[PDB]
Design an enzyme around this catalytic site. Structure first.
Site, PDB file in Angstrom:
ATOM      1  N   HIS A  19       0.815  -1.212   0.000  1.00 39.48           N
ATOM      2  CA  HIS A  19       0.000   0.000   0.000  1.00 39.48           C
ATOM      3  C   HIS A  19       0.848   1.262   0.000  1.00 39.48           C
ATOM      4  CE1 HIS A  19       0.006   0.296   4.555  1.00 39.48           C
ATOM      5  NE2 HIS A  19      -0.116   1.572   4.238  1.00 39.48           N
TER       6      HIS A  19
ATOM      7  N   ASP B 299      -0.114  -7.553   1.795  1.00 43.06           N
ATOM      8  CA  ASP B 299       0.399  -6.177   1.801  1.00 43.06           C
ATOM      9  C   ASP B 299       1.927  -6.193   1.927  1.00 43.06           C
ATOM     10  OD1 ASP B 299       0.490  -3.424   1.746  1.00 43.06           O
ATOM     11  OD2 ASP B 299      -0.284  -3.161   3.796  1.00 43.06           O
TER      12      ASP B 299
ATOM     13  N   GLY C 159       2.247   6.689   8.797  1.00 49.26           N
ATOM     14  CA  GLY C 159       3.624   7.039   8.515  1.00 49.26           C
ATOM     15  C   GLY C 159       4.630   5.984   8.928  1.00 49.26           C
TER      16      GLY C 159
ATOM     17  N   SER D  67       3.850   2.773   8.253  1.00 52.77           N
ATOM     18  CA  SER D  67       3.541   1.694   7.323  1.00 52.77           C
ATOM     19  C   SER D  67       4.740   1.342   6.475  1.00 52.77           C
ATOM     20  CB  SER D  67       2.389   2.067   6.402  1.00 52.77           C
ATOM     21  OG  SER D  67       1.192   2.067   7.131  1.00 52.77           O
ATOM     22  N   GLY D  68       4.876   0.036   6.235  1.00 53.37           N
ATOM     23  CA  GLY D  68       5.972  -0.493   5.470  1.00 53.37           C
ATOM     24  C   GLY D  68       7.182  -0.862   6.298  1.00 53.37           C
TER      25      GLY D  68
END
Ligand code: CA
Length: 223
Positions: free
Chosen positions: A40, A84, A175, A177-178
């Site tokens: 995402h 994801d 922020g 995420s990942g």
């Protein structure tokens, strides 16, 4: 990260910032030329920033390397956030040292109750907005699948796990995420989603990396 602590400069040496003019997602360095992040977080024009602590100041340990290729998982579903996960190839290899280092992929999946380290530059408030400039850290346990499914009925797949605190107060946030979830020195999760941040009975949800090791290895070997 809500309710965390300041990691300290370069104490999380596999943490990357994805930059498109500004920080927008985290990631993890898995070898000198590849980063893993959340699907995402996909966009064109990514610069990977390694060796960062303060993302607004050049402190001397940074390496800035553009992406040459991005590969979103073949079965990523943006509506459910199943699968994801995304791989990013760097245009040139990073220079590895004590402050910029890769994180190992897991050979086995981690069990509920295992303590992990989650890190990022995301929002530090559960209500309102304050973005830190330095890297924040949180220690949190993996929750049982039953508690995770009870918190998010109908939403948890076999490719997700929950980690955090059902009482709230400590969580990942926008922020982050990942970015990485590291347990016993291996990359077990990717910061994926949640309902708000740090709310009671709504822990963060993470991509379960151990389900993807074969795809990661085969993709790197041929790209
Ligand atoms: Ca910096």
């Amino acid at each position: 990260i809500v309710g965390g602590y300041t990691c300290g400069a370069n104490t999380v040496p596999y943490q990357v910032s994805l930059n498109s003019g500004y920080h927008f997602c985290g990631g993890s360095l898995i070898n000198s030329q590849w980063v893993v992040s959340a699907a995402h977080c996909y966009k064109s024009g990514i610069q990977v920033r390694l060796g960062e602590d303060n993302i607004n100041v050049v402190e001397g340990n940074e390496q800035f390397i553009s992406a040459s290729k991005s590969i979103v998982h073949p079965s990523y579903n943006s509506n459910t956030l199943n699968n994801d996960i995304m791989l990013i190839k760097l245009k040139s290899a990073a220079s590895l040292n004590s402050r910029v280092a890769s994180i190992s992929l897991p050979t086995s999946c981690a069990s509920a109750g295992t303590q992990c380290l989650i890190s990022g530059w995301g929002n530090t408030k559960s209500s309102g907005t304050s973005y830190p400039d330095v890297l924040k850290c949180l220690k949190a346990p993996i929750l049982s699948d039953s508690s995770c499914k009870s918190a998010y009925p109908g939403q948890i797949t076999s490719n997700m796990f929950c980690a955090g605190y059902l009482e709230g107060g400590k969580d990942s946030c926008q922020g982050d995420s990942g970015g990485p979830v590291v347990c016993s020195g291996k990359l077990q999760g990717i910061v994926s989603w949640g309902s708000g941040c740090a709310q009671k009975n709504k822990p963060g949800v993470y991509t379960k990396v151990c389900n993807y090791v074969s795809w990661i290895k085969q993709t790197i070997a041929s790209n």
